[PDB]
Design a binder for this molecule. Structure first.
Ligand SMILES: Nc1ncnc2c1ncn2[C@@H]1O[C@H](COP(=O)(O)OP(=O)(O)OP(=O)(O)O)[C@@H](O)[C@H]1O
Ligand SMILES: [Mg+2]
Lengths: 94, 38, 286, 100, 194, 209, 49, 211, 49, 150
């Protein structure tokens, strides 16, 4: 659910969401890390879990539309930078 | 020629101890080797 | 897989183009099919020759199609007499994209070469991509419980030439190819072409997603799985650690660039010195 | 046919944006700069020698002996190209592949 | 380079037309304490047989060297004043007697601050046998020059050491020397055009 | 075109499998000869900077001479087995060839190969085949051998102090050797392999038994 | 020989150098043709004995 | 043997002393002399003073030294193990168990102090290795020495650049720093700039002389 | 000091109640774009030369 | 038991004892015990070495997953005291078995080595390469889907 910029889950968040005690949260992450469901690391000093990868899941049509909008923004960025490089280096472009 | 060989042998004795500068002991050992032994 | 890279020689491209043109002189055709001969080097295919075979198909039905396999065997023997080290490694066709009956044709070809490779060679001069697209038949074991079927797994395709083949190509490309451009300009043009190719690939993905959203195509549930990984792989360039590392690396390269430019300027001054001295000597003796 | 043959040695779009390994890139930069160190040390001597050298020896004396100026030019060209290409590719990738 | 050459010829010295051997060894020690790192100074000068044998007859120079090496900073400062008065009268060290001494002072300060995270100003003054105000002025001058990697909290009179990366110190010298070479190139081209 | 220097050589270096199995411990009672060979061959290869610092001029070549069967060729074997440098074993009679010019050509090929693979040791067993002091100008054999010897002298003379190549020549009839081969810069270290003394005899007996 | 700029010729009688002295080699005085070409010359011979 | 003894007494390089002791051991063993063990002892001792204790065991494992395997070789092997483990407590235990064979041999007894100092440095490095910020009292407890002595030794080691760190007296904590290696690229660039400035000076002479 | 801080002369702050000035911790210069800018000026000048 | 040493998760020494020690040390009449963990001196030494292997496996797992961990938490998960766990970790670090920096003043263990800019930018470049490869593969899969449903 969380965007890639905010995939740092506090121990309290996992404990509350999973209906488990805080001291067990780490062990839960261990299983999810061992099976391969998720990827990341655990910072037990700050009681946080840095999650970097998720098992891909079945998406709804609306989620696919949002993904296509993300692709629209990505295509706009790629095209803009391609035109920038073509314009700036036009004289030396082969 | 024997004196020159004594100088070279003093350098060789300095080498055998992995030293850079030739010392008087090296010259005396070279004299002993060049003259008495040979 | 059994195939890591497929190298298609320019002779194969020219033979495919010539076959397509001579068949299309009839004025009624869609694609032509032939057999690919090459050698094997580690896990890298070396497609180096080809020969046309009679082939036809129905425009409407995909199950109706005729391929002359006796012709295939006879010309395989004839080519093997000339070059024994070139064996059947697959087939080709000039259709711009795959066909529903391509799997059946690959099954027919697999008797002659068990790990047959289908190299779709687009005769039309595509501006960005390579004219060749290599595929190998695999048994796709789905996890949805659907029965295992035969699909075409893509294979990285490259155009490589033999020494004499490269000599001939350079003779034919003598006028068109411009080699005066420096290496740096070539790399920057490579970067521009990479940007264009990435834009084209992203636009293809976007078009597929647009068709899926409006229901023109069903949700594959496997392309979506790959796309989630693709979007997860997008790095965060706004991180403090990454920004500091990028700045440090850029400065490390810029100091080297500065040293190189300083040495270049000094060498250029030395060249100017030599030129002025030579001019003064020439005018002094004359 | 000319367009078809033009695809020979045409590099894939992926390696256009592909960045060289930064460890090997730094090692190469350090090695070439260390080479130009000795090359410039010899270049000074080459300038002084060519100051006092007759015009018949401008090329005969260059036979069998490396030219510090030529190797310096080659190293400069190589490092300029490599570092400029790497920097430009990294800067392009920082815009193209972005999370936002 | 003077220290390197002097240490190379400390056991082969025969140039008595230039200086006496005792004077040569004193010069060698003087340049070594300013040009050598602590391990190099220990291996070559502190444990050097010839240098120690000569220093047996030169108590002042041995005191000057070992006070720095053994971190007797007040003794080192007194010996540095004596050494300064020696350099002022030497035609070889006269142009640099102001420079050398200053550098030595920096070295001493740097040494006292090398192993400690932070030092009170009073502790520095007591170690060097000077006033707190003198330590404040000297440390401020040398930090402003960028020679000491520390900052002074005058409110609490605590010098806190820093660990700047060698990359910054290499980059600043790269800028400086590249600018010097670039000025030479520019002026050479200026000469060439006319 | 210009061919790579290591290419175009009829004589090859010793590979790992061609290394002799003779050890220094296998040789008994030649401590003086072992020390002289080590100080003149194997030590300058690894400690040339020390030789320069001290002021010693390392000997370019070594002439091992003595009565037959006194450990010359075996000491060469032990050097080849216990060296980190390239070893180029050759025999003097190999240089004399029917094709005129091939002798000097392969001599300079040997020296070029050694130079390109520095540090290297050149061993020429039975040096009398190309280093006799008498030459008949009207016989093709003596003319070719004179050419071979002159090329050998030139190759040894063209080796500056920088090139890390050591040359070893072995013979049991050094009285017949040309004096020009023993001049400084060619063979500055004549090591004699005399008949064993009583202590040498007992050392050899113990080592062999 | 070095200080007076006189050419130093060593006559060892070696046959290896005979080709340089002359293809005749029947008399040692055939070397004089070379010596006259490098006058002033110092002809040196050392008796090994 | 006397040459090696004098060489070690003058605290010169220990490689030459080891070579002299090796020749003495070979000579004494060839004639089957009772002193061949003594020259063996110092042979191992040099290896300890050369900061290469791992060789000592190999030296004992040789055929010539298998004849002399006894209390002296055991003492030197155990002190080699103490140096190899970088353990000062092992050094003291070795000095206690083999006091007759080590503390009473004058040649070894003379260098025992320097051996103790070297093992002190090694054990301090080993103790502070797993830490990035560690209380000085903990280091003293691990090393079994006074806190003042530990602090003085650590300060001297920092001044000697044996390891990278600082000493916080106010909290009495040693902070160990993972310093980065100097950039060889920048050093080479600086020296290249200097040499190219020399090149520009040569071009200056050529230009002003020829125009 | 307030004018100097506002103008960017020095990176610091003033504690009026305490009555002192706290200088900001020095930032790693080489991890910023300033070395890149200086190298840019020098590189452009060298290429112009 | 072997699966316990193959799974990439934490294993507790107390649970291991209470689940297998009787079957390993004393054994059963149906399945006799080997002399590996017998009551003799060698059996006791091998039992101690088994505990060492268990705690070292736990430290390896905790290094793979955790980036920083409290010394208290490390001791709790190792079934050891703070001093014993710290000593074992120090022994592992000295032998170069496992990298870890112990900020003992704050009671923190850092399994994360300092990030070389080479390493960080190489991770970024590897991410870019994998992204481009996945984009190409997705394009090919899209082509197959277009073929099937056209
Ligand atoms: N010191 C030695 N210890 C043991 N064996 C020896 C020793 N010296 C010579 N030999 C014996 O010499 C034999 C071969 O002689 P070697 O080739 O070494 O002699 P050489 O001097 O090269 O002879 P030649 O002059 O006839 O070529 C070997 O089988 C070896 O056992
Ligand atoms: Mg022989």
């Amino acid at each position: 659910t969380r965007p890639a910029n905010h995939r740092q889950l506090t121990f309290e968040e996992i404990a509350k969401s999973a209906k488990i005690t805080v001291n067990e949260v780490e062990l839960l992450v261990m299983k999810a890390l061992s099976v391969g469901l998720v990827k990341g690391s655990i910072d037990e000093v700050d009681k946080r879990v840095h999650m970097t990868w998720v098992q891909p899941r079945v998406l709804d049509l609306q989620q696919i539309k949002g993904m296509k909008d993300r692709l629209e923004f990505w295509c706009t960025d790629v095209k803009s930078m391609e035109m920038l490089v073509e314009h700036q280096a036009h004289d030396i472009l082969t | 020629a024997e004196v020159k060989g004594v100088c070279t042998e003093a350098g060789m004795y300095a080498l055998r101890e992995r030293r850079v500068h030739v010392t008087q002991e090296d010259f005396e050992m070279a004299v002993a080797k060049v003259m008495q032994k040979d | 897989l059994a195939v890591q890279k497929v190298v298609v020689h320019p002779l194969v491209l020219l033979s495919v183009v010539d076959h397509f043109n001579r068949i299309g002189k009839v004025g009624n055709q869609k694609r032509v099919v032939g057999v690919l001969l090459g050698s094997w080097q580690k896990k890298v295919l070396d497609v180096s020759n080809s020969f046309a075979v009679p082939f036809d198909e129905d425009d409407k039905d995909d199950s109706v199609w005729f391929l002359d396999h006796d012709y295939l065997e006879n010309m395989y023997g004839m080519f093997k007499k000339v070059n024994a080290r070139e064996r059947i490694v697959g087939w080709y066709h000039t259709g711009p994209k795959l066909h529903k009956n391509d799997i059946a044709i690959n099954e027919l070809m697999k008797r002659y070469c068990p790990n047959s490779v289908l190299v779709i060679i687009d005769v039309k001069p595509k501006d960005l991509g390579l004219p060749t697209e290599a595929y190998i038949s695999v048994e796709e074991v789905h996890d949805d419980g659907t029965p295992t079927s035969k699909t075409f797994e893509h294979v990285t395709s490259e155009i490589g030439a033999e020494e004499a083949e490269e000599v001939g190509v350079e003779h034919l490309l003598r006028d068109i190819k411009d080699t005066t451009v420096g290496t740096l300009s070539q790399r920057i043009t490579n970067q521009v072409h990479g940007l264009k190719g990435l834009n084209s690939k992203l636009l293809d993905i976007r078009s597929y997603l647009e068709k899926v959203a409006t229901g023109k195509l069903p949700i594959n549930h496997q392309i979506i799985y790959q796309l989630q990984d693709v979007f997860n792989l997008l790095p965060d360039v706004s991180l403090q650690e990454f920004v500091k590392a990028f700045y440090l690396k850029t400065n490390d390269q810029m100091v080297v660039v500065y040293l190189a430019s300083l040495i270049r300027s000094v060498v250029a001054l030395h060249n100017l010195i030599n030129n002025k001295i030579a001019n003064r000597d020439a005018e002094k003796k004359e | 046919e000319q367009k078809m043959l033009l695809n020979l040695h045409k590099k894939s779009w992926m390696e256009g944006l592909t960045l060289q390994d930064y460890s090997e890139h730094c090692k190469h930069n350090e090695s070439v700069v260390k080479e130009m160190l000795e090359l410039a040390k010899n270049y000074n001597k080459a300038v002084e020698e060519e100051d006092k050298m007759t015009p018949e020896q401008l090329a005969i004396k260059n036979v069998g002996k490396q030219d510090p100026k030529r190797h310096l030019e080659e190293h400069v060209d190589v490092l300029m190209t490599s570092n400029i290409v790497q920097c430009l590719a990294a800067m392009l990738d920082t815009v193209v592949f972005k999370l936002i | 380079q003077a220290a390197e050459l002097f240490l190379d010829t400390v056991s082969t010295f025969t140039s008595y037309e230039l200086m006496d051997y005792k004077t040569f060894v004193t010069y060698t020690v003087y340049v070594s304490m300013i040009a050598l790192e602590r391990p190099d100074l220990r291996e070559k000068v502190i444990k050097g047989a010839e240098i120690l044998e000569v220093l047996h007859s030169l108590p002042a120079v041995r005191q000057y060297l070992f006070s720095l090496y053994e971190c007797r900073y007040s003794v080192f400062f007194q010996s540095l004043a004596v050494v300064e008065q020696e350099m002022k009268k030497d035609w070889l060290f006269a142009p640099h007697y102001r420079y050398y001494v200053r550098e030595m002072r920096i070295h001493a300060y740097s040494q006292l601050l090398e192993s400690y995270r932070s030092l009170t100003l009073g502790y520095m003054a007591e170690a060097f046998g000077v006033g707190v105000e003198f330590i404040d002025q000297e440390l401020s001058r040398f930090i402003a020059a960028g020679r000491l990697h520390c900052k002074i909290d005058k409110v609490n009179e605590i010098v806190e050491t820093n660990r700047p990366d060698s990359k910054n110190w290499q980059y600043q010298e790269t800028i400086k020397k590249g600018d010097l070479l670039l000025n030479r190139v520019q002026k050479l081209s200026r000469v060439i055009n006319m | 075109d210009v061919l790579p220097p290591e290419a175009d050589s009829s004589i090859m270096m010793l590979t790992s499998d061609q290394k002799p199995d003779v050890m220094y411990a296998d040789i008994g009672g030649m401590d003086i000869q072992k020390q002289e060979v080590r100080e003149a061959v194997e030590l300058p290869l690894t400690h040339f900077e020390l030789y320069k610092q001290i002021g010693i001029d390392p000997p370019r070549g070594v002439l091992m001479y003595g009565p037959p069967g006194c450990g010359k060729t075996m000491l060469a074997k032990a050097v080849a087995h216990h060296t980190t440098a390239a070893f180029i074993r050759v025999v003097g009679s190999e240089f004399v060839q029917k094709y005129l010019g091939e002798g000097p050509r392969m001599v300079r090929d040997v020296f070029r190969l050694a130079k390109e693979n520095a540090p290297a040791i050149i061993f020429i067993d039975e040096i009398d085949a190309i280093a006799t002091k008498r030459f008949d100008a009207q016989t093709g054999a003596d003319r070719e051998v004179q050419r071979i010897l002159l090329e050998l002298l030139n190759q040894m003379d063209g080796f500056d102090q920088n090139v890390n190549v050591k040359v070893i020549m072995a013979t049991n009839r050094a009285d017949t050797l040309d004096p020009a081969l023993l001049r400084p810069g060619r063979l500055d270290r004549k090591i004699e392999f005399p008949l064993p003394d009583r202590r040498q005899k007992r050392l050899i007996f113990s080592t062999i038994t | 020989a070095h200080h007076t700029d006189c050419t130093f010729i060593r006559v060892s009688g070696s046959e290896l150098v005979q080709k340089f002295i002359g293809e005749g080699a029947r008399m040692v005085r055939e070397l004089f043709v070379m010596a006259r070409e490098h006058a002033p010359s110092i002809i040196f011979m050392d008796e090994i004995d | 043997m006397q040459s090696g003894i004098i060489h070690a007494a003058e605290e010169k390089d220990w490689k030459t002393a080891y070579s002299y002791f090796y020749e003495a051991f070979e000579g004494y063993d060839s004639i089957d002399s009772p002193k061949a063990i003594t020259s063996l002892k110092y042979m191992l001792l040099c290896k300890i003073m050369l900061n290469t204790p791992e060789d000592v065991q190999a030296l004992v494992s040789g055929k010539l030294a298998l004849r002399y395997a006894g209390r002296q070789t055991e003492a030197l092997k155990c002190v080699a193990q103490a140096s190899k483990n970088r353990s000062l407590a092992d050094f003291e235990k070795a000095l206690t168990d083999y006091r007759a064979e080590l503390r009473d041999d004058p040649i070894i007894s003379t260098h025992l102090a320097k051996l103790y100092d070297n093992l002190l440095e090694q054990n301090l490095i080993r103790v502070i290795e797993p830490f990035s910020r560690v209380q000085i009292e903990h280091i003293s407890s691990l090393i079994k020495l006074s806190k003042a002595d530990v602090e003085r030794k650590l300060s001297q080691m920092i001044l000697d650049k044996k390891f990278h760190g600082i000493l916080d007296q106010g909290e009495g904590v040693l902070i160990i720093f993972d310093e980065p290696p100097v950039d060889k690229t920048y050093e080479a660039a600086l020296e290249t700039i200097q040499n190219m400035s020399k090149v520009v000076d040569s071009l200056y002479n050529k230009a002003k002389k020829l125009t | 000091v307030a004018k100097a801080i506002r103008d960017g002369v020095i990176e610091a702050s003033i504690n009026h109640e305490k009555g002192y000035v706290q200088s900001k911790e020095m930032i790693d210069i080489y991890s910023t774009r300033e070395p890149q800018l200086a190298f840019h000026q020098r590189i452009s000048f060298c290429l112009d030369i | 038991l072997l699966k316990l040493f193959t799974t990439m998760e934490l294993m507790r020494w107390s649970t291991l004892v209470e689940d297998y020690g009787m079957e390993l040390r004393k054994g059963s009449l149906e399945s006799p015990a080997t002399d590996v963990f017998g009551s003799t001196e060698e059996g006791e030494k091998r039992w101690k070495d088994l505990k060492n292997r268990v705690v070292e496996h736990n430290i390896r797992i905790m290094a793979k997953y955790y980036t920083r961990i409290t010394m208290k938490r490390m001791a709790q998960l190792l079934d050891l005291s703070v001093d014993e766990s710290e000593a074992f970790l120090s022994n592992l670090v000295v032998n170069k078995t496992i990298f870890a920096k112990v900020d003992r003043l704050a009671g923190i263990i850092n399994f994360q080595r300092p990030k070389d800019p080479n390493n960080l930018l190489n991770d970024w470049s590897q991410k870019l390469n994998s992204l481009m490869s996945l984009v190409n593969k997705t394009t090919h899969l899209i082509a197959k889907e277009e073929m099937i449903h056209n």
